[PDB]
Design a protein around this ligand. Structure first.
Ligand code: NAD
Ligand code: NAD
Ligand code: NAD
Ligand code: NAD
Lengths: 418, 418, 418, 418
């Protein structure tokens, strides 16, 4: 109910800004339908154990329910219900024909063997099965789960139905009806998001400075595709330190090191390439750069350090890095931040594309996929802009919240729900 | 949560007496599946309100989930999960091929308008529709619901399947595939069970004196069917006092004045039929009668008054009339008490008989229905007695919880669940 | 294929006798449908294995398919196709609305661990699932299978549909929606059949010396129920020897000590009773009784010992105990041989009742069930008797088969199949 | 069974060369499902007849089963099971999400009328109906069948589902949701493969000499498109003889005179083209050419003529034209032979494209169809080629098989099947 409150405030805040009837907020604060279950599993080493899991199907209007499932020992309904609501605003803002769901299972995957894990996975999918499906609810991986856990579920559902049902789960192995672009979908998306921002602020991202935080799965690929567009990745921090380069770091090294972890991949720019290694994860901030990209964790661009920020553009790659207090501070100095909800939505858009491909049992090539993925992204930005520019005091954040909140309201009205 | 904690302890006490593995208890302690739903209703005044509702489905093994739904404001899942647990054992004990479930909806029906109520009922059914059917989960009425509500849910479900589904809900109007016996179902059972226990103890019931407490739906019908079996109903009470007649009360008046409220029945036994009267509804405990039948409210026989009970046999028509302490007190005095899970099951069994009739689109006459109900009841009273006499230091209560718990245990074994 | 070539002629014989068209023979020759599956099992004590299985579905005119499933290593398709054909005729003759089928899985159940057997059993039900159902095809146990295996199958199929499906497999545990009367269903039937025949040849079975060969399941209860009808059993054989007693073997002992194996039973007759023991299971043949009942195995009355037979009436309780050559001889001596397809059909009939009960989720008492079984058998022997006497030269065998080929034939015509 | 043992051995090698566990061979060896059915047909002036048919569904891992249905009198199960295993491998190699299946009906269509042939075709689609469907099993034409027959099966299936289900059968009439490109699919694919194989060996087909064997449906269109790619068709043969012309045969005569049989087209080259014509058809094995294409029958290049071919590149147009022994020879003589499983896969590929179009109810133009078709084949070639070089001693066929076994094995592992 902690995190939940926050979301209930995030959405409630948006409503007041969009002048929406209290009735609208009503049907949004409560999930449409929630299924709680207890999966019984017989440990290969031992006796019995029944795990409690669930699926949160928040809203349907734009299309089928979409959302990943978590496998963490400290999970609760309220958080996922709260998360599910967020998933509804994201898809809506992404311009996808998706609803918003979120599932979970209370267990520590690091306590189960391959047999016990696959056993639980199959069990969870078989349990919620009567309520999911390729056109009703398409679960996806999250925290504990991964492409492999999804695969087992896809297979379990397929045996129940008696035929192969690929579209019921997304982000599955390339060998099991999946699309490879998923590897850098979020990154490529972050790069396209920002590239479009510059084209409207400075006229183009070409030849611009870039300071990315976190060479994980987001930051890493955000730097690669960024340069391919015309940016200069001069800094790429991480837990250890940073990698400076006034000419621009050689990101092409990332293609031949897609498994060189994040921290080590930071050293690579120091050991192999010739770059300045300033051991300190708090330097990329004050560093004189055009664009700063926090693609690591949350609570990074707080108020106590908001002053250090030198970049005039902040594309939130990580989830909720800039605190509300900082959001204000940064906006009153010129620095503008792009709503993470919009920027890192490339992940969902990718799952969407995988899904569409599954329905017509046809897989597109990398080039093909990347283009549609980009096209959507490019069109999502153009939308939030018009709203943002047609209002004073309204931050990108607010523009994005309303824009999403407005698509849902619109659908519900036409549909005759309110 | 305190009531649940109470039901779980109750189950443990039984899991041990029967000597079942803890794994068995692991499967029963948690419900098989829960479906929380939020149905929005358009009120007359204003236009919007979303209600909280759900359907707990405890265990399958003996057959489809069965259980009523509660329409009450102060409702919580925990308590309802507990009821579904008790509904599972009760069905097992009754010999019915039923599972056990329980649904609820937080709302006060005495606040909604006739229209709004129908709208809510149809919304509840339509929301839980995918998880119910005449062979998967058959709901029924409870505290805030009645026959009329069942009717609105039967019609709704039927307009969803595209044809008539009479067995998807029991306890429905006689004019809508119901069975008139429901009126006296429970009372007829209490009477059948009391007679059987009387036989296996005194050799016969008739001539035996009976004192029933409460002239409600259970009590008034128990006092009527018991006299038909030979008993001698000499005393009946309600909130307004007690009606005594040594020669014996004329129960025929009950059938000639059913629906004549409860307290008006008491005064009726005084006006028409000559009967003494005392302005004290607690005098029935004092009476020196052979059999005492509490058919009103719980905690009526506490440890602070157990020593005032003369009766040698106590048959529970209501739920929880005897306190765990009063139970022991009386027991070590020679007074045996017949468990409610066994005695008042005449209502649950009747619903079974209605369901079976609905599946074959054939409704038996009243005599046919009665004979099938009497048969089941009698057989149930046998199974509990035989076991009760096998162990030592075992109360009737104990025998039921184990006998019902053992039928579920074996079911899960053959099925390969444990 | 030798057994199949046999059955095909067994039928062709009936076709020429009844004078049915050859087009009829054509359709009844080949099975309507045949599903072959390979189930991969992960041997616990090992790695992998792929078992071969199938399910033959012969004729559907009378109603849904009904046959048993064999778990045996020497099972071949052809034999089962032949077994299917016979099952269709047997179900027709039995006066049931069943089409008769057959199934088998090549394996030695006595070579697989319990965990392995369940897995295999569950895989067979899962594989053929798309072609079975409480109203399309209801399997049953047979040689390598049993009630427990039937349970695992019902269970599996049920987790596939999503709800409980009892009527999908018969001969299931009494605790899992089965019926007790199945214990002695076959025997009782043989008892009723011999009783009816004695009423048409001698006018009553009262005081008739009977000799039962084998004390397994059939002979065991055939002897017990036979006495209750007035007959008197003097001899009973088995692998160990023969129990003689002209006064009458105390059959009540059979119910007292059931499940005491075959050979042990013969001894019990020597211990508790004063029966005379003879070390030779071929003595029963030489005995001069009124009614002989072969209930052990096939090829018991061959053409080399037919003359030795003294009984005036022969009732087959086993499958094919009388050899063809012997049937011929046994007949030109005034000895009537009641066909196995008519006498031991008590088993199929009992499976039909259990089924009819599951469809209505209502279980009948042993009384109701026994009486119903008896009824069907009587009208069968009756129906078969009228035609037998109508023709000259015909053997009960002929009359039996022809009666069967007739009900199926009349059905195909009315439906427009031929 | 001879061909079955042959195909089984053909796949045994691959399992070894690839280093897969024997478990893989276990499950891949036996067909998952086998539906055998007997369709009764009422002959015209005649009477009755029951035709035997079946569908072998081998392996559904990469996607829904796919395979053709044969109408030949000399048909046997084993052979069809064998062919189904090949289809399973072929579909894998083709990079299509297709399983592998094969159907057959034992009959000689050149004996039945149109009315009877229609009744047989519909009865077959109707008999297997429960085990097929646009996402389960998509049959197709083969020896005794064609588009006309598929049309009848599609209609019979559509009247069973209650709506039009076009994607259940492929290679159906252009007027019936089909695609024209099917006409030259195989030949175009063979042409694309060789053109791609040339580039790797030399650097282009432009200028290279080509010799084809048989101007049927495969060779004919292989020659047409081959020339369009820079090739120089100097020899086209058939049963009637050969046609040489070092300058290059004008293929325009093919398209314009499409549907002019095989041999006739050959004469047309001797009449409307100054090409030589030698009676002896074996001459094609002497002409020194860069590329040779056997597109007529099997057993064309054996051990007795292997050492005579001049071509440095041989592309298998027909099925199994090159003898195992001759393969040994030709290879150790510097001649590379392109596996038929890979080369003529063009028709199976097109079959996939027709399907995709049916699922989205949209038909592309010839250009669109050919681009996707060309791409797939080009990609299949690369995959095989790249793996072929990674090992020594291996042959094109060797790498082709393993390339196919790998995609399947991988999917089975990720799925938990092994
Ligand atoms: N592709 C996705 O899964 C996805 C989509 C939704 C949103 N985003 C969000 O992006 C964030 C990161 O995701 P990811 O996939 O890149 O994670 P990741 O786990 O692959 O990488 C995170 C990186 O952060 C670095 N890091 C930790 N603390 C740091 C600090 N103080 N300063 C600098 N670097 C630090 C780590 O060393 C690591 O390399 C999350 O908040 C996530 O929700 C990711
Ligand atoms: N047939 C059923 O619905 C059913 C089945 C399950 C269990 N029982 C249980 O039996 C009890 C009564 O059910 P019912 O359907 O007859 O209810 P009811 O409302 O028809 O009647 C209860 C009666 O109790 C009387 N009463 C209350 N306090 C009393 C007191 N101190 N002394 C004497 N009379 C008193 C009331 O005035 C009323 O007439 C409940 O606890 C119920 O759950 C009933
Ligand atoms: N009850 C049924 O399931 C059923 C229904 C169909 C037909 N019948 C047929 O009846 C036959 C027997 O079945 P069952 O279930 O009673 O078998 P069972 O296995 O229970 O008992 C068979 C008995 O035959 C005895 N036996 C073997 N050889 C003997 C010999 N030479 N002389 C004397 N006794 C001998 C054994 O010792 C054993 O006690 C089978 O052929 C079966 O197919 C039975
Ligand atoms: N397009 C397809 O359907 C397809 C796909 C799978 C594989 N291939 C295989 O290709 C082979 C041929 O198919 P098609 O469609 O061209 O067949 P087709 O019947 O249309 O043509 C074959 C041609 O081969 C000629 N021929 C036979 N023996 C010959 C000889 N000794 N010398 C020269 N010519 C000879 C015939 O006269 C005929 O014109 C078959 O084995 C088939 O399975 C075809």
């Amino acid at each position: 109910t902690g995190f939940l409150e926050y979301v209930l405030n995030y959405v409630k805040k948006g409503v007041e800004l969009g002048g929406f009837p209290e009735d609208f907020y009503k049907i949004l604060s409560r999930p449409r339908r929630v299924l709680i279950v207890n999966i019984p599993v017989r440990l290969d080493g031992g006796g019995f154990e029944v795990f409690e899991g669930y699926r949160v199907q928040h809203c349907d209007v734009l299309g089928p329910y979409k959302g990943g499932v978590r496998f963490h020992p400290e999970v609760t309904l309220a958080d996922d219900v709260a998360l599910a609501i967020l998933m509804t605003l994201k898809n809506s803002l992404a311009g996808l024909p998706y609803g918003g769901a979120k599932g979970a299972v209370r267990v520590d995957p690091k306590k189960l063997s391959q047999r016990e894990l696959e056993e639980l996975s199959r069990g969870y999918a078989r349990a919620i099965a009567p309520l999911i499906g390729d056109v009703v609810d398409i679960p996806a991986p999250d925290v504990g789960t991964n492409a492999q856990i999804m695969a087992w579920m896809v297979d379990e559902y397929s045996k129940i139905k008696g035929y192969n049902v690929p579209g019921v789960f997304t982000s599955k192995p390339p060998e099991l009806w999946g699309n490879p672009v998923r590897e850098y979908a979020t990154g490529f998306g972050v790069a396209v998001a920002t590239r479009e921002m510059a084209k409207k602020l400075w006229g183009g991202i070409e030849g611009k400075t870039v300071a990315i935080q976190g060479m994980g799965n987001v930051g890493r690929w955000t730097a690669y595709w960024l340069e391919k567009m015309g940016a200069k990745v001069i800094a790429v921090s991480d837990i250890n330190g940073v990698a400076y380069r006034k000419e621009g770091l050689n990101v092409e090294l990332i293609q031949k090191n897609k498994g060189l972890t994040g921290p080590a991949l930071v050293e690579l720019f120091t050991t192999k390439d010739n770059a300045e290694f300033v051991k300190n994860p708090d330097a990329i901030f004050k560093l004189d750069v055009d664009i700063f990209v926090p693609a690591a964790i949350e609570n990074v661009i707080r108020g106590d350090n908001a002053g250090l920020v030198k970049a005039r553009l902040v594309v939130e790659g990580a989830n909720g890095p800039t605190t509300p207090e900082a959001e204000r501070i940064l906006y009153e100095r010129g620095v503008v931040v792009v709503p993470d909800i919009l920027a890192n939505a490339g992940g969902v858009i990718m799952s969407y594309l995988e899904w569409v491909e599954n329905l017509q049992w046809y897989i597109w090539d990398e080039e093909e996929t990347r283009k549609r993925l980009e096209n959507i992204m490019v069109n999502n930005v153009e939308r939030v802009y018009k709203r943002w520019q047609r209002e004073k005091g309204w931050t990108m954040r607010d523009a994005a919240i309303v824009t999403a909140l407005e698509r849902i309201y619109n659908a519900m009205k036409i549909r005759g729900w309110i």
